[PDB]
Amino acid sequence: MEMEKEFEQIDKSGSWAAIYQDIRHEASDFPSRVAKLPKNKNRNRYRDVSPFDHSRIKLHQEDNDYINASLIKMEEAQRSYILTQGPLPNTVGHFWEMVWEQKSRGVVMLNRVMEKGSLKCAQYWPQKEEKEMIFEDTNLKLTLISEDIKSYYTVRQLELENLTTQETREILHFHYTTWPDFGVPESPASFLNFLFKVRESGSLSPEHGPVVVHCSAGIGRSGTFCLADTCLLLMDKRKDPSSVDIKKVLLEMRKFRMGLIQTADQLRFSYLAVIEGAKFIMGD
Numbered sequence: 001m002e003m004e005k006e007f008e009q010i011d012k013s014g015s016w017a018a019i020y021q022d023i024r025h026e027a028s029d030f031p032s033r034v035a036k037l038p039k040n041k042n043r044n045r046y047r048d049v050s051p052f053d054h055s056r057i058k059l060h061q062e063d064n065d066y067i068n069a070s071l072i073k074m075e076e077a078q079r080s081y082i083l084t085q086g087p088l089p090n091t092v093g094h095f096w097e098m099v100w101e102q103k104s105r106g107v108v109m110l111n112r113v114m115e116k117g118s119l120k121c122a123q124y125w126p127q128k129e130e131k132e133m134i135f136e137d138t139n140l141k142l143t144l145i146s147e148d149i150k151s152y153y154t155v156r157q158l159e160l161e162n163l164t165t166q167e168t169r170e171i172l173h174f175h176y177t178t179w180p181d182f183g184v185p186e187s188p189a190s191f192l193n194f195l196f197k198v199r200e201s202g203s204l205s206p207e208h209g210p211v212v213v214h215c216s217a218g219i220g221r222s223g224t225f226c227l228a229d230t231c232l233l234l235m236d237k238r239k240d241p242s243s244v245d246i247k248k249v250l251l252e253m254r255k256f257r258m259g260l261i262q263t264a265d266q267l268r269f270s271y272l273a274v275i276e277g278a279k280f281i282m283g284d
Ligand SMILES: CC[C@H](O)[C@@H]1N(C(=O)OC)[C@H]2CC[C@]1(O)CC2
Pocket: 146, 147, 148, 155, 156, 157, 201
């Protein structure tokens, strides 16, 4: 079926939970043996969220190459994404090592450091220009260059230096600051505006390594971001945009990381975002 009318048909019939459970039943199951080794327990935020072995990002280190991060490679859309958990106190150096080694331009953060009165990820970037951060375990230096605070999101320019080689690179930090502590946003308008700002920066384009996207577990809000982006790109590429099947795209993405889209409310919100976004693209 088309999307917008399949949407109203699920609303009128109140069957979002059943649609979402079908996705959960059909989703791929691949091994994640490296994630479960005892030496990696303090590298995982949640025991039930792990990268598959076949798609995990490997650190360029011979001691321990593990990070909780997955490469989502979308062949028809010609987009790739790295989805990862919010860094932990003992993985902030690994996080920036990955950004460096994978040649990423942008980092997309969809959570606040504290939500619901608990810490959802480490304070992994510097908050003042004159107070830079050094990660001694991976030999990197990170400096805040500039910060632009807007009503729904903040953009930061960061400098990452590889202290071994003295090479430097500019990284863009896109921080969506207004996702509510509970539920999903009422309108997708600010989330779409944010997506378009990431796109306009070059961070999603083939001349760079894959964008790094995270929330707390790296599957819920993060899944919503890449699902919406890929679906809108396919609607621009194809002769028949109504052939884009959001459930099929989501199942394809779940071949590369488990659990993408965590609730039926997140599924409904993804539909809403793609539907509204398709009108603004045109040609609107
Ligand atoms: C809209 C521009 C974009 O956000 C970037 N920026 C920034 O922090 O934006 C708030 C700096 C200067 C322009 C940039 O494109 C590059 C770094």
